[PDB]
Design a protein around this ligand. Sequence first.
Ligand code: JNT
Length: 159
Amino acid sequence: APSYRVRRADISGHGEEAVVNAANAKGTVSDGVCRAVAKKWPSSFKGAATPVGTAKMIRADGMTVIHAVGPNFSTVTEAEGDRELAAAYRAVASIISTNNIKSVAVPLLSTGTFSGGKDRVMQSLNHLFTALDATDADVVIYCRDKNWEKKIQEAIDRR
Ligand SMILES: Nc1ncnc2c1ncn2[C@@H]1O[C@H](COP(=O)(O)OP(=O)(O)OC[C@@H](O)[C@@H](O)[C@@H](O)CO)[C@@H](O)[C@H]1O
């Protein structure tokens, strides 16, 4: 069974075996988690382009980087976005289990740039749990907001 905990820290300082980038489909560096990942592991972006709802892994800069493309909720219906968000997290879980990754730092996909202006912390976290429950990985969820940290911790605890 996987273990879940939450850190309020820059994900670029994670202590896990792998990190999930909240990526865009073009594999470009822009504001958000992606900027922190590009600064710390700059060569991890080579050929990282992957369609919405998929994930693409690379070993670069002594790190395993998993580029997961959550939906942009400005560009899909709510139901379409919810399916694509579930798919991105399942693509992450498959890469974790198939590559024998023992621990992973995970941001909440589609809760920032891609949130379409809405609070999607619980939507994103519920898809994260459902997908990563298929793995044996130690999962560390990263956020920057003290309120999010407690929400996430509350949600971890309720389980
Ligand atoms: N350094 C950090 N450490 C820990 N948590 C962080 C972080 N930077 C941002 N976050 C949080 O991670 C979540 C996903 O944000 P993001 O805005 O990065 O994630 P999405 O909403 O999936 O959008 C991805 C796009 O921004 C895409 O173009 C990429 O360029 C960006 O990733 C948001 O809740 C942010 O508050």
